[PDB]
């Protein structure tokens, strides 16, 4: 629309007279003789030339905006389509899984497949888990409790496991962590090595 609009305002500015007796040059030439025509034609030329100036200048500004937008569509191509983005809300709302490009007239359309969490559930949490006077932090998860028992799930999906000692790691004593709770960290060895 903006392009056809500025390309129509350009044409329909040919029939403006800018202060000439008429717009038609053929007329002013078949009519009034050279010198007194040179005056009018000079007005029409100044006008019809500043009209092109404004057209071109408006299109150099519009084209800088399309370039700013085709450098973003080129970035979104490389990062969303040819990869998996971690930049938030870059490739669609959610956690980006992948994107698919689809062409369109004078543009591109990305279908951003994202992973949205759903059906949350309150739990009770804890920074660490004091077992032997030593604090146990989760190795790659979070401690939750279904009210009575403690587990260690991944942070993005409720999948509770038993707090063993190979999904938690130890550091220090239960004396400095604010909010630590007492619980049992099941060791697979001592269970096995109680032969």
């Amino acid at each position: 629309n903006h392009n056809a609009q500025a390309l129509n305002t350009l044409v329909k500015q040919l029939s403006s007279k800018f202060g000439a007796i008429s717009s038609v040059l053929n007329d002013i030439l078949s009519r009034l003789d050279p010198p007194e025509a040179e005056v009018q034609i000079d007005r029409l030329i100044t006008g019809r030339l500043q009209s092109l100036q404004t057209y071109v200048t408006q299109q150099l500004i519009r084209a800088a905006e399309i370039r700013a937008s085709a450098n973003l569509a080129a970035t979104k191509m490389s990062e969303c389509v040819l990869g998996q983005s971690k930049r938030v809300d870059f490739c669609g709302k959610g956690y980006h899984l992948m994107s698919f490009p689809q062409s369109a007239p004078h543009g591109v359309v990305f279908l951003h497949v994202t992973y949205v969490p759903a059906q949350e559930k309150n739990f009770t949490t804890a920074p660490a888990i004091c077992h032997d006077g030593k604090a146990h932090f989760p190795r790659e998860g979070v401690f939750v409790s279904n009210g009575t028992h403690w587990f260690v799930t991944q942070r993005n999906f409720y999948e509770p496991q038993i707090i063993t000692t190979d999904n938690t790691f130890v550091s220090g004593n239960c004396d400095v962590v604010i909010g630590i709770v007492n619980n049992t960290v099941y060791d697979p060895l001592q269970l096995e090595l109680d032969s």
Partner: protein, 133 residues
């Protein structure tokens, strides 16, 4: 919306003088953007249909009769999260959602025949034009 006036102005009482002879006579509300005439100022707060400015939107809502209402847009649902020293919320399902994003990549590439436009295809006018550098 008479942009940027007091209604009490807007022809104190429209009687004419106000260029734009035509007149409207419905409820006269006073936005901070001008003197919105013709729209009834409800006291709800919806989404924004037609931005008027200074926080006021306007929309066409059913009352039986469908009328034009002007409200103060609401920024969305309200939601406090049960923040607690020791409580966390963890998803249990998920949702794969596909959204789209349209982007302009290129625009129409024109060219102009500087003379044939300015001077008309066939004119010693063009012979004058080259004077212009």
């Amino acid at each position: 919306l008479y942009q940027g006036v007091n209604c009490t102005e807007v022809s104190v009482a429209i009687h004419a003088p106000t260029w734009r002879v035509y007149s409207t006579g419905s409820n006269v509300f006073q936005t901070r953007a001008g003197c919105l005439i013709g729209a009834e100022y409800v006291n709800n707060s919806y989404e924004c249909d037609i931005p008027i400015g200074a926080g006021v939107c306007a929309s066409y809502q059913t009352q039986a009769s469908q009328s034009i209402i002007a409200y103060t847009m609401s920024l969305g649902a309200e939601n406090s999260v049960a923040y607690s020293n020791n409580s966390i919320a963890i998803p249990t399902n998920f949702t794969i959602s596909v959204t789209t994003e349209i982007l302009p990549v290129s625009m129409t590439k024109t060219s102009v025949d500087c003379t044939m436009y300015i001077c008309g295809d066939s004119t010693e006018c063009s012979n004058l034009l080259l004077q212009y550098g």
